[PDB]
Amino acid sequence: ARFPEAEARIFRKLVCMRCGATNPWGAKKCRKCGYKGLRPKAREPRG
Amino acid sequence: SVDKAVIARLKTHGETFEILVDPYLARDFKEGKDVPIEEILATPYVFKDAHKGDKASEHEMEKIFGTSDPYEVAKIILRKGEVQLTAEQRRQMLEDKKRYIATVIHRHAVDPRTGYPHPVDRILRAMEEAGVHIDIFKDAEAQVPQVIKAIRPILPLKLEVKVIAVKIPGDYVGRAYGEVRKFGNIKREEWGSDGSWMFVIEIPGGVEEEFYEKLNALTKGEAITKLLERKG
Amino acid sequence: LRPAKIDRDVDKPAYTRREYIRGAPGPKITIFDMGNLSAEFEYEVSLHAEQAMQIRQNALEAIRIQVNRYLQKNVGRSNYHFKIRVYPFQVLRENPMAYGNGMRRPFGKPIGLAARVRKDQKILTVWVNGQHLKFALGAMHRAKMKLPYSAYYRIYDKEGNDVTTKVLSTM
Amino acid sequence: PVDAWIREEIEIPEGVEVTVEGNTVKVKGPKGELQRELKYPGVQIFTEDGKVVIYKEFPRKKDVAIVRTFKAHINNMIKGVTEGFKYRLKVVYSHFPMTVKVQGDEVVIENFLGEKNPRRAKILPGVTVKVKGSEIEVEGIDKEAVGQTAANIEQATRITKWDRRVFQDGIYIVEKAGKPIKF
Amino acid sequence: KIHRPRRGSLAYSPRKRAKSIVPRIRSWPKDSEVRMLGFAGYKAGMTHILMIDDSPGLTKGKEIFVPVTIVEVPPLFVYGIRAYKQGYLGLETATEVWFHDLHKNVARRIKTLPKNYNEEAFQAKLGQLEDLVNDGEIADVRLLVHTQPWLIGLKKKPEVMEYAIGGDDVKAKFDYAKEKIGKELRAGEVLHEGELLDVIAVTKGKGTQGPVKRWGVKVQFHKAQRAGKGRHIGNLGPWHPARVMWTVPQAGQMGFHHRTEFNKRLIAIGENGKLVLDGNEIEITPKGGFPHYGIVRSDFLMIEGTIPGSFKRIIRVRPAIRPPKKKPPVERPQITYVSRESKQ
Amino acid sequence: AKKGAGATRGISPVRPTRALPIGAYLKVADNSGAKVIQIIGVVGYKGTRRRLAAAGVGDMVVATVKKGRPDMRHQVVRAVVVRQRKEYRRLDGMRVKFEDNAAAIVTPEGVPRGTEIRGAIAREAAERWVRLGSIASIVL
RNA sequence: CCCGAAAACAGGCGGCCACCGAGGGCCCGGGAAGAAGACCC
RNA sequence: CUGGGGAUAACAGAGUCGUCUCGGGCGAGAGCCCAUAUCGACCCCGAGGCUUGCUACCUCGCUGUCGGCUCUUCCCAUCCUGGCCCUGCAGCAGGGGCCAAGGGUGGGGGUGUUCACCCAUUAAAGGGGAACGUGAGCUGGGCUUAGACCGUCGUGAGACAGGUCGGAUGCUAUCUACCGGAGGUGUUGGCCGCCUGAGGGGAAGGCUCCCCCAGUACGAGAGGAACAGGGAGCCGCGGCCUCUGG
RNA sequence: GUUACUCCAAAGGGUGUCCCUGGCCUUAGACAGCGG
Ligand SMILES: [Zn+2]
């Protein structure tokens, strides 16, 4: 139950570490805040 | 922050001198610490009364106590006097300390009948029943040893280190090694030709279902285990 | 403690003389030179104040600790001669009012110390070689954050001439 | 400004007739005919002998962007009336197979996550959908309507209540106008 | 702070005496069947029946107690046709046509009737209106109707009203109206047993009442009851705004209001005072007569539940402008018992 | 259909009136230690400013035990009202009332803590709690 | 759903009278309406 | 007791914001590794005017009061209800954040209490403003006169931002405001009847539980959902007297 | 924004747009792409 076709459209996203808004894949800063720290949407669980 | 500073006094030689201290730093000051009595006190003097306003005579102090510095006589007031903690704080601190004791005992004490643990709830119940003299200015770690015997007969139990022998078909060993050694005291870590991890641990004996359930949750119930003698 | 906007400005007379001030406090800062002191580095990166300012010794010590830890983790004690140039000589006072007597006999008791700085004055300096200008700029930024007003950094060569634009272009 | 007289030019292909009626562009070809309104202050669209020319006589950045966008739109219209566009979708499920069927102007999806209720996607006019098992094709003559139909078929299957690392069932685009989607 | 909802509704304000005892209908339902969209009668009384439940929900299929109101409905008379056109903002009347032979009693409402107005003039006016409607200007056609209170010996001054027609073609509506004018119209030709209806009437009067009863205000503490303020409100408001707010409850007129009810079911339509249950013909009038209303003798509607108004008051009925989605069937239900014992 | 064989609840179409507010004393009809209880709550009820929660036949209440063997006294229990003095209507229109107010002690699920109910109980209660008429000898 | 021609573009329609008298009120017997007025038969 | 004082306190208001309530920047680190799921030192920058202080501009017979009951309204920095995003979100539940102020936010014990504490229910039982809303609306438990007792201080007369018992509550509405009810003028001659519907008001509805979907998806197990579809009830609103009670 | 003053919110950020300056690659450069 992996479905790379589903993953390529659920998980091709960036997240902002200040406000949390999602951003396109190649963004360099955020839309609402201008923060420069974007991390990719988590594709495996952490901790 | 004099708004809620509390009072401590020392009565001797026929006079009365109050202080205005922080209720939670006086706690440390008399518990035994490296003490910033400056931060403890609220106003830098000694006085007849906190609600009236009368700081006593310097040579009156010189006579009775023997000192000129006010911080030193306030230090000795905190030494040999009594702080006016509110009933709220007294109750709260008493309860917190005895909860600490109940945990400190349960986590490594069990009955020699079958090995079951004694829950903290009925530990507290046995305490309240027998009657325990919990000190609110003493150190818990150091006052437990008395509380041991004062409650042993009403509720018998011993310090019973359990020692266990565990098996794992290592496929998540790289997910359980650190998790299970967080506990500590892992002896003779051994292996097998099937990459399966077999060992013998010597943790405390009270906490067992924690270990069991965490292993089962981390291995999807793919773990074998056997309790060796409960070496006390 | 009390906010720094109370002590930021320099509109009061100087109050730096201890033979007359009763109960003045000692400094909480003792180290002003860190790193290597006899190593004749190339580039001098210096901070400069944008307007007149009054810096607390607390801020000074925080700047020191942070910048030095950074330079140690990244550059190495063998390099980075780090200096703070200004000493706290001003004495700050607070009115002992908050039973009370309010504004009766208001003349503050001493509480702390501060350094006075005028416009376009040097505050601190990092002496470093070319391969660590990145970290010297990082330290500039970190120190800039912990100041009551704004400041600008410049760079100097041996003979003390400005080469800031030429060095900034070519990285 | 940027330059003086920004000017973009498109060459008209085999049998494509391009006309302007004041702010509209008519594009006829072997298949179908398309219309589109494109206007911006100062931008002029006019036809030469065999060319489409887009002109502005003292432009800024935003005007340059507008011009290039209009050029791209006209090229898309030409390519559409010449060949067409084709999008591709892939169906996947873990449990509860779902059936997708075409009903007039709507695509209906049944047994999604086991729901007793069907999901519905609206097909726009001029688009045709074909379902052959786990693969779906949206063929059409205009890119915007085609992509919108595809997007509607996709958005008819979106979850918000459960973790998508585990609940992954649905329909997904795999090919846009002949351009695979890669991570 | 304690929260609670305010006392009374602001949706029925100002709470004043009704403009007329004859109630006005403001909105009409959208019906595809070309028919007159309502009727009018007089309230007679209440009784109860035992019927087998039809509507969706629990209790379906069981024998249940159901309260019932009776409304006497003698036939109406159609005396006119009106045409409406579209003006700048809304509808405006274009013209009217009347019948030539009207009862002598109609002059008690309309003091000024025409002098000669013969049948040929009436027909010429009909023709003019027909040609006017046959173009495309006209937007709506309505009937003009008057009650006949003299058949049932209640009074002699009729009530005069206007009623709309269903459908969406002015020409169909006009054909219907032209085949109706000048005649008597019965309730069985208009209503269908099992329908849901909205009833309209003016409520019973109660005069001036205080806020405890007019708004549901609380009675104060017994200390205030002995002080002289039990049935009063605390205060009229705060210091600022330095005026009394219109939302503060106060004493005034209670009752005699225009009110509309929703979704009352029509159970049965009777003729000449009788109802047919199982071949029998039984009388609805209880032994001794209805209290404050005598014997029913012409025709009557049986409506479920309660309706606004005193006994001899004029009631208006229309079909279900706002019905639910799970309507019960349009068919008379199975009735096992009708009470006609004494009611006083 | 999940769990209907082993069951504790059913449906009744009457909905009697609410006759007993908070503070009412109820005689116990079950063969449990309790004899008299007091109402301190009505399960499931939401009211308004200065309104007392009230209960009727078939409703579950929270109560305190005032009389009975020491094991039960001074405890908080649940119970169901099985007969009341205030008359209530049925579907045919005839009203029904009883001789006294009484209840039966149950578990939060609806399971009786007892094996015998003395006296007639109401069909409304028996319908809403299917595990009572079993242990009741008269149901009207 | 409730109020609503004093909506100052202070409205539309039909009918009656005027350019002695249409119509309205007091009065009389009474309520389904009501503090005086008003409303209804 | 007399004469005065807003040249001067208590008291609400104005000003200010040290303190208070609510936030932000940078990044030492904690989090098995991983600053930024969550937490976030030291140091710097702010908003509000709902806490307390500071000042003494206004009032010295304007009203000098706290709390409670009753009645109306507003703000959002959102406790529940509607819709979404990230997660160290398998499911059930939890953390954190975004849009939204339409509706809801209750009943009891001790205490004069506000607050705080506890009990059983509940979808949840949010917090503020309106002269610390509201005495020509009520109450009078506290507080702050004259009587009396205890403790302490004082030679004493006496006193105590110490404790305790007792201890007056006035109004015929002049103007405006609001709730309802009438009489006129105007609308370019008078009158009867039926309509239109510009404008204004509305919460006229809000919420919960049960059945089935289903012991299904998910999950090693333990446990454990959802879309649609069927029913019932609580709170609020508007009416009526056939039945039942007064 | 349409504020001389009496009587107007910041630290920190912004491939938002309009300008100035100083270096480095260029006729095969700086993306993507046929081809490791
Ligand atoms: Zn952001």
How far is it between the farthest Cα atoms of chain C? 66
Q: DSSP alpha helices (H): ranges in A1-47? A: 4-10
**What DSSP string runs through D125-138?**
TTEEEEEETTEEEE
B/e letters for B1-32, b = 16+ CB within 10 Å, e = fewer, are: eeeebbbbbbeeeeeebbbbbbbeebbebbee
Name the nearest CA neighbour of D81 among D124, D142, D137, D20: D142
* E305 Cα to chain F: minimum distance (Å): 15
How far does residue D164's CA lie from ligand 1's centre (Å)? Answer: 23
- Between the alpha carbon of residue E309 and those of residues B103, C167, E269, E298, the distances in Å are 76, 96, 21, 21
Q: Give CA–CA dist F62/F79, Å, rounded.
A: 7
User: Coil, strand, or helix at residue F61?
Assistant: strand
Q: Quick one: how far is CA E311 from the chain centroid? A: 13
Main-chain dihedrals φ then ψ at residue A3, nearest 5 degrees:
55, 75
Burial class from Cβ neighbours inside 10 Å (0-12, 13-18, 19+) for residue D148 reads middle
User: How many CB atoms are closer than 10 A to CB D123?
Assistant: 21
Hey, what are F37's tokens?
């209880």
Burial class from Cβ neighbours inside 10 Å (0-12, 13-18, 19+) for residue E10 reads exposed
Please say whether the dihedral angle defined by the alpha carbons of residues D73, D79, D82 and D83, taken in this order, is positive or negative: negative
Q: Write the single-letter amino acid at E17.
A: R
Q: Give CA–CA dist F7/F10, Å, rounded.
A: 8
Name the pairing type of β-strands F102-106 and F25-28: parallel
* F36 Cα to chain E: minimum distance (Å): 33
User: How many CB atoms are closer than 10 A to CB C51?
Assistant: 14
* E51 Cα to chain F: minimum distance (Å): 10
Using an 8 Å Cβ cutoff, are D181 and D175 in contact? yes
- Between the alpha carbon of residue B68 and those of residues B15, B48, B57, B59, B63, the distances in Å are 17, 17, 10, 7, 10
Q: Give CA–CA dist E333/E322, Å, rounded.
A: 22
Q: Quick one: how far is CA D27 from the chain centroid? A: 17
Measured in residues, chain D has a length of 183
Q: F48: which chain E residues are within 8 Å (Cβ-Cβ)?
A: 4-5
H or E stretch at B29: helix B25-31
- Between the alpha carbon of residue D72 and those of residues A44, D16, D27, E168, E260, the distances in Å are 39, 16, 14, 50, 62
Q: Give CA–CA dist A17/E11, Å, rounded.
A: 50
Specify which residues D85 forms β-bridges with: D140
Burial class from Cβ neighbours inside 10 Å (0-12, 13-18, 19+) for residue D81 reads buried
Using an 8 Å Cβ cutoff, are B14 and B63 in contact? no
The chains found to touch A (3+ Cβ pairs under 8 angstroms) are: D
CB within 8 Å: A10 and D181: no
Q: Residue E241, preceding bond cis, omega within 30 degrees?
A: yes
Q: DSSP alpha helices (H): ranges in chain D? A: 61-82, 143-155
Task: Say whether the A–D interface has 3 or more Cβ pairs within 8 Å.
Answer: yes
Q: E50: which chain F residues are within 8 Å (Cβ-Cβ)?
A: 92-93
Please say whether the dihedral angle defined by the alpha carbons of residues B211, B214, B215 and B221, taken in this order, is positive or negative: positive
How far does residue A30's CA lie from ligand 1's centre (Å)? Answer: 5
Of F13, F49, F92, the CB nearest to E58: F13
Q: Give CA–CA dist D142/D154, Å, rounded.
A: 19
Specify which residues E258 forms β-bridges with: E202
Gap from E243 CA to H75 C1', Å: 21
Q: What angle do CA E56, E62, E65 make, to 5 degrees?
A: 95
- Between the alpha carbon of residue B62 and those of residues B57, B70, B73, the distances in Å are 9, 10, 10
Specify which residues E47 forms β-bridges with: E68
CB-based contact, A7 to chain D, within 8 Å: yes
Hey, what are F86's tokens?
């205030």
Main-chain dihedrals φ then ψ at residue B2, nearest 5 degrees:
-55, -20
Q: Give CA–CA dist D73/E33, Å, rounded.
A: 52
Nucleotide nearest to A29 (CA to C1'): I14
What are the start-end ranges of the E strands in chain F? 20-21, 25-28, 34-42, 54-55, 60-68, 76-83, 88-89, 95-96, 102-106
Hey, what are D13's tokens?
């292909």
Determine the number of helices (DSSP H) and then strands (DSSP E) in chain A.
1, 3
User: How many CB atoms are closer than 10 A to CB C72?
Assistant: 14
- Resolution of the PDB structure in angstroms: 2.7
User: Coil, strand, or helix at residue B216?
Assistant: helix
Hey, what are E230's tokens?
């039990």
- Residues with Cβ within 8 Å of C68's Cβ and at least 6 positions away in sequence, in order, are C34, C35, C82
Measured in residues, chain F has a length of 140
Q: Give CA–CA dist E160/E22, Å, rounded.
A: 9
H or E stretch at E198: strand E196-202
Question: Which own/partner contact pairs does C135-143 have at CB distance under 8 Å and 24+ positions apart?
Answer: C135/C70, C135/C71, C135/C74, C135/C75, C135/C80, C136/C43, C136/C45, C136/C80, C137/C45, C138/C70, C138/C74, C139/C67, C139/C70, C139/C71, C140/C45, C140/C47, C142/C63, C142/C66, C142/C67, C142/C70, C143/C47, C143/C63, C143/C66, C143/C67
Using an 8 Å Cβ cutoff, are C140 and C63 in contact? no
User: How many CB atoms are closer than 10 A to CB F33?
Assistant: 18
Alpha-carbon Rg for chain D in angstroms: 21
Gap from E25 CA to H238 C1', Å: 18
3-state secondary structure B111-166: CCCCCCECCHHHHHHHHHHHCCCCCCCCCHHHHHHHHHHHHCCCCCCEECCCCEEE
CB-based contact, A41 to chain D, within 8 Å: no
- Between the alpha carbon of residue E210 and those of residues E14, E203, E224, F106, the distances in Å are 16, 18, 17, 48
Question: Which DSSP symbol is given to F137?
Answer: S
Q: Write the single-letter amino acid at D22.
A: G
Report the first-to-last Cα separation within chain D, whole angstroms.
Answer: 39
Hey, what are C109's tokens?
């008791």
**Residues ending a continuous segment of chain A before a break (C–N > 2.5 Å):** none
Nucleic strand H contacts from chain F, 9-68, CB < 7 Å: 9, 11, 13, 15, 18, 22, 40-53, 62
Q: Is the CB of C105 under 7 A from strand H?
A: no
Q: DSSP alpha helices (H): ranges in chain C? A: 57-74, 133-145, 164-169
- Between the alpha carbon of residue E254 and those of residues B74, E13, E212, E220, E233, the distances in Å are 78, 12, 12, 22, 17
B/e letters for E251-289, b = 16+ CB within 10 Å, e = fewer, are: bebbbbbbebeebbbbbbbbeebebeeeeeeebbbbeeb
Q: What angle do CA E46, E50, E53 make, to 5 degrees?
A: 115
Q: Write the single-letter amino acid at E303.
A: I
H or E stretch at D108: strand D106-110
Q: Give CA–CA dist F102/F118, Å, rounded.
A: 10
Q: Write the single-letter amino acid at F73.
A: R
CB within 8 Å: E65 and F93: yes
Using an 8 Å Cβ cutoff, are E315 and E201 in contact? yes
Using an 8 Å Cβ cutoff, are C160 and C80 in contact? no
Of E4, E5, E65, the CB nearest to F91: E65
Hey, what are D137's tokens?
């094709």
Q: Give CA–CA dist E24/E16, Å, rounded.
A: 16
Q: What angle do CA B69, B72, B78 make, to 5 degrees?
A: 145
How far is it between the farthest Cα atoms of chain B? 85
Nucleic strand H contacts from chain F, 96-135, CB < 7 Å: none
Q: Give CA–CA dist E272/E75, Å, rounded.
A: 12
Q: Write the single-letter amino acid at E275.
A: L
Q: Give CA–CA dist F56/F85, Å, rounded.
A: 10
H or E stretch at C114: strand C109-117
Nearest CA in chain A to D92: A3
Q: Give CA–CA dist B173/B186, Å, rounded.
A: 14
Q: Give CA–CA dist B185/B201, Å, rounded.
A: 6
Q: Give CA–CA dist E8/E254, Å, rounded.
A: 13
Q: Give CA–CA dist E262/E321, Å, rounded.
A: 8
User: Coil, strand, or helix at residue E28?
Assistant: coil
Q: Is the CB of E209 under 7 A from strand G?
A: no
Nearest CA in chain A to D183: A8
Of E2, E4, E62, the CB nearest to F91: E62
Hey, what are E298's tokens?
């012409």
Q: Give CA–CA dist E80/C61, Å, rounded.
A: 101
Solved with: cryo-EM
SS3 content of chain C, % helix, strand, coil (to 5): 25, 25, 50
Q: E59: which chain F residues are within 8 Å (Cβ-Cβ)?
A: 13, 91
Question: What is the edge-to-edge ordering of all strands in the sheet holding B186-190?
Answer: B186-190, B197-201, B164-168, B224-227
- Residues with Cβ within 8 Å of D98's Cβ and at least 6 positions away in sequence, in order, are D91, D109, D110, D111, D112, D169
Alpha-carbon Rg for chain A in angstroms: 12
